[PDB]
Amino acid sequence: WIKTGELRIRIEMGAYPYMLHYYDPRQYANAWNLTSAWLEEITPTSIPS
Amino acid sequence: PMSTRIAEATSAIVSKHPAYQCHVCSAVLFSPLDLD
Numbered sequence: 001w002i003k004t005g006e007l008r009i010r011i012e013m014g015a016y017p018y019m020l021h022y023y024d025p026r027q028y029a030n031a032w033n034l035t036s037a038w039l040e041e042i043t044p045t046s047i048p049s
Numbered sequence: 050p051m052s053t054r055i056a057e058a059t060s061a062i063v064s065k066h067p068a069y070q071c072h073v074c075s076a077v078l079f080s081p082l083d084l085d
């Protein structure tokens with residue numbers, strides 16, 4: 001639903017480490033891969049940047 | 050020949066001493082460098 005549907009979620013975090021991925025503006029770019037892997041790797045213990 | 054005439058013509062007057070992807074045009078490329 002999140003990917004191709006109309007669901008948008010705001011995750012309350014407070015503070016969090018972040019990481020940057022720069023890209024060339026003049027070329028297609030779809031961040032689903034990264035945001036997927038982020039969600040995939042969340043844990044009752046962990047939470048990647 | 051003209052040159053030959055000119056020569057002969059002057060030779061009678063002589064005297065001597067006496068004794069990837071591009072959204073602009075849609076062309077497809079293969080190198081990031083080939084794009085720039």
Ligand SMILES: [Zn+2]
Nearest residue numbers: 071073074076
């Ligand atoms: Zn072009």
